[PDB]
Amino acid sequence: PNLTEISKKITESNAVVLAVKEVETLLTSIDELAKAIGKKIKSDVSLDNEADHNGSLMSGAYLISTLITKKISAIKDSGELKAEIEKAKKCSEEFTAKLKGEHTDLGKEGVTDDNAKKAILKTNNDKTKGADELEKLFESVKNLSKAAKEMLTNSVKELTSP
Amino acid sequence: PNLTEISKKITESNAVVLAVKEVETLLTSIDELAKAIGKKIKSDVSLDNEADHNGSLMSGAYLISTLITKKISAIKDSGELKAEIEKAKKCSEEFTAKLKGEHTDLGKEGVTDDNAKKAILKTNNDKTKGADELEKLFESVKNLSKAAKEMLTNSVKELTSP
Ligand SMILES: [Zn+2]
Ligand SMILES: [Zn+2]
Ligand SMILES: [Zn+2]
What we know:
The structure is a homodimer.
Chain A: H1 3-34, E1 39-40, E2 48-49, H2 55-72, H3 82-101, H4 103-106, H5 113-120, H6 131-157
Antiparallel strand pairs in A: 1-2
Helix pairs in contact in A: 1-2, 1-6, 2-3, 3-6
Bound molecules: zinc ion (3 copies).
């Protein structure tokens, strides 16, 4: 086995996995934001209640959604992941577009807990203000991560293979 | 060159860099939240102004700070990154604690843009409500990222060296 070609592929594949991890983690940060809906920091580990003032929180989620698209475009291409990358990107753009289009209810300081959940809480029943797109975006990145990790693991096992 | 010994090492190292990348990205997400201070969503790429209602945003940052500590604590280490991980974990705890201590100014929906920046804008002139701790944590995680990267880059170099 040519150690030169394998080491190169390992390095390249690992860079791809790390790039996808950034995207995956940003989605994770939004899920954490969702748990802060209708809450306020009290003097405890647990948060206190303060309903319907989720505007700044939603603005934060919105900026992260734009960063996500930029990170997806930062993944080094090679065709092998073209399909997965394109799907994740369009879904990330759809999510951001949905949040923008719902600015009537999401673009003000007084965003209600209920509307905030329809936008960023994937486990909400009503996902009509962005949550639906977020859920799909989660799946597309999940499929992208599996394919990426697959290329990495396969590149490494080439060292000991057969 | 025990390829089976080097491969297991590369696999382990890849797992550490990935875990650290997750922590690093959560920090990036807080920096993105800082950019939403005093802003609201509108039908455009750029946010509009909506000053002094950053409470929900701060609660989101708070939950992410606790997630960061959990992620750091779950990283696998045999002692090579012993020091780096401990420092990062301690600084992450200090950041969360600082925010809790400022619950009076940060625990309400009407958090002023000025106080929000003292809490999560690491480049702010006044960093007395958490931003000082945030910057220390940011640097500590970068130190951890560098150390992890080197551990991985070296294990991979063993393929074409000596
Ligand atoms: Zn109120
Ligand atoms: Zn106001
Ligand atoms: Zn107090």
